[PDB]
Design a protein around this ligand. Structure first.
Ligand SMILES: *[C@@H]1O[C@H](CO[C@@H]2O[C@@H](C)[C@@H](O)[C@@H](O)[C@@H]2O)[C@@H](O[C@@H]2O[C@H](CO)[C@@H](O)[C@H](O)[C@H]2NC(C)=O)[C@H](O)[C@H]1NC(C)=O
Ligand SMILES: *[C@@H]1O[C@H](CO)[C@@H](O)[C@H](O)[C@H]1NC(C)=O
Ligand SMILES: *[C@@H]1O[C@H](CO)[C@@H](O)[C@H](O)[C@H]1NC(C)=O
Lengths: 420, 111
């Protein structure tokens, strides 16, 4: 069902479909270290990806349906040079007819053109004054379905965001060549990242789109806040999804000391551009291998690990006394060689029992392989103290709404720009 | 009181850590570059037509103090009570507020 699908291979980009699309790549196209299947394009002329189809699959029909899907990571817009500056990132237009994908300040645009120069555009708008965004500098699964008979639709992370009728458009003749390059961007320090570009010759329904989203999500591997792979030996700031105005902190170091959620969070501002919340607040959480059999640094599902807490540029260990009063075992930061036999091994979870993808959960365990429970928070006398509890396990068993046991790992990223 | 206000028209401070406690002043047209403001109290002090550019504010207590027609660039407000009502018609660019002090959301006077 897929006609074009750019994937990575041995030091090149190939097309998985049985059409063998020729791909021409500029000398300034970059790749990640860890997920080299994600591609980076910067604002220069040499940052070029050129893919050429065959004549047998050129879109030149009257009522042919088609769809596209890809993942995009768009950095934060920092200044007012970025306003009112729609720039094209994916181009498929020849002779003022075709389809194109463009970006503006806080927008992702899908555009269609016929030979009569009719414009139909479908836009996904995300604000950038929000405290915590799901779209700024984070991976977004964008898929667009076009029904030549009814209307055209844009889907963000599997859900329908906008739709506009395209019945009036009569004939689209797209180009033989597809261009991945920033066009018309006045900011010289601007870039995007894309991955998993696919094309289909039918309008996908919500079922197929959700299937594709789940299949391409790599549910077996944890993801950090930006949507990249989670890695051992790397500092991470911690965000609790249930209470996202507070950041993890400690007050003392030892068995007597505890760690809690302190707030409120700060803010990073550029007047009339962005008024987000500071994400580099609190104590970093390094994750260390304990029993990972994989050679890579990637943290996968059910990987028993250790957790180091960075306090005053010194490393400590996240552990509890399993035998204490109550169900909520309070988490504490200990000297790494003075932990003894306290429960420290954490089982990292990416998906649930049924395999449904969810956020990051940490399951504190003892040396007997017994579940103290999911790591969360519990308020003691108006202090939101970090605990490990089996209550969260009970709600998970009862398919209830767990409160406070889901976490995000926030490393320092260049696309956010906060001053640490 | 308003009769005794001192005015300093035009200033250019650059690379100094600069604390004080000033009362009933107006600064107009200042230009500060890479300055540190640690542990200072401001009573009825008003900054006007100023530029702050990689400045740093730490432990600032503000009593009826305003920044009008002021421009802040790559500045940090750490542990300060300079809330959003003390920047009248200002522009912040890539500025950061951290560990804001507790206080009222409106100017209540500190008599
Ligand atoms: C606003 O900041 C961004 C991000 O830069 C980071 O944050 C700053 C506050 C400061 O701490 C920098 O040292 C940080 O790197 C600036 O955008 C980047 O600027 C750097 C040079 O400083 C440049 O190398 C990058 O390419 C820029 N990245 C992007 C995405 O543009 C931005 O320039 C600052 N705003 C203004 C108006 O200058
Ligand atoms: C703060 O101000 C006082 C008097 O204005 C000065 O003596 C002192 O040195 C200042 N603090 C620092 C850290 O220099
Ligand atoms: C301050 O003066 C006027 C506003 O009264 C304005 O034209 C000018 O640009 C301002 N200066 C700065 C640096 O913002």
């Amino acid at each position: 069902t897929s006609i074009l699908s750019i994937v990575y291979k041995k030091d090149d980009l190939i097309d998985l479909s049985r059409y063998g699309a020729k791909i021409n790549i500029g000398d300034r196209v970059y790749y990640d270290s860890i997920d080299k299947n994600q591609i980076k394009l910067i604002n220069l002329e040499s940052s070029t990806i050129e893919v050429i189809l065959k004549n047998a699959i050129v879109y030149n029909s009257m009522y042919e349906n088609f769809s596209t899907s890809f993942w995009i990571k768009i950095p934060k817009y920092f200044s007012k040079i970025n306003l009112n500056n729609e720039y094209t990132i994916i181009n498929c237009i020849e002779n003022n007819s075709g389809w194109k994908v463009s970006l503006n300040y806080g927008e992702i645009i899908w555009t269609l053109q016929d030979n009569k120069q009719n414009i139909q555009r479908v836009v996904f708008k995300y604000s950038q004054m929000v405290n915590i965004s799901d779209y700024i500098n984070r991976w977004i699964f964008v898929t667009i379905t076009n029904n030549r008979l009814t209307k055209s639709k844009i889907y963000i992370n599997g859900r329908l965001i906008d739709q506009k009728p395209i019945s009036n458009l009569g004939n689209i003749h797209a180009s033989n060549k597809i261009m991945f390059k920033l066009d018309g961007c006045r900011d010289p320090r601007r870039y995007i990242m894309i991955k998993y570009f696919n094309l289909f010759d039918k309008e996908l329904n919500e079922k197929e789109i959700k299937d594709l989203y789940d299949s391409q999500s790599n549910s077996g591997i944890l993801k950090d806040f930006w949507g990249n792979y989670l890695q051992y030996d790397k500092p991470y700031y911690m965000l609790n999804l249930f209470d996202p105005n507070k950041y993890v902190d400690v007050n003392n170091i030892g068995i007597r000391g505890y760690m809690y959620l302190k707030g409120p969070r700060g803010s990073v501002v550029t007047t009339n551009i962005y008024l987000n919340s500071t994400l580099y607040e609190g104590t970093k959480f390094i994750i260390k291998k304990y029993a990972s059999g994989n050679e890579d640094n990637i943290v996968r599902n059910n990987d028993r690990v250790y957790i180091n807490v960075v306090v005053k540029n010194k490393e400590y260990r996240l552990a509890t006394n399993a035998s204490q009063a109550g169900v909520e075992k309070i988490l504490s930061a200990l000297e790494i060689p003075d932990v003894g036999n306290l429960s420290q091994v954490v089982v990292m979870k990416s998906k649930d029992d049924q395999g449904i993808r969810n956020k990051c959960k940490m399951n504190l365990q003892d040396n007997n392989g017994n579940d103290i429970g999911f790591i969360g928070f519990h308020l003691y006398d108006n202090i939101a103290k970090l605990v490990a509890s089996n209550w969260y396990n009970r709600q998970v068993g009862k398919a209830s709404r767990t409160f406070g046991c889901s976490w995000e790992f926030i490393p320092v990223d260049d696309g956010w720009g906060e001053s640490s | 009181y308003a009769s005794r206000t001192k005015v300093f028209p035009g200033e250019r401070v650059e690379h100094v850590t600069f604390n004080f406690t000033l009362e009933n002043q107006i600064h107009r047209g200042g230009q500060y570059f890479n300055d540190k403001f640690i542990g200072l109290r401001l009573k009825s002090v008003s900054f006007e037509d100023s530029l702050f550019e990689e400045c740093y504010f730490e432990d600032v207590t503000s009593s009826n103090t305003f920044f009008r027609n002021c421009t802040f660039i790559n500045t940090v407000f750490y542990n300060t009570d300079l809330f959003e009502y003390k920047f009248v018609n200002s522009r912040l660019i890539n500025s950061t507020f951290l560990h804001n002090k507790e206080g009222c959301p409106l100017d209540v006077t500190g008599t």
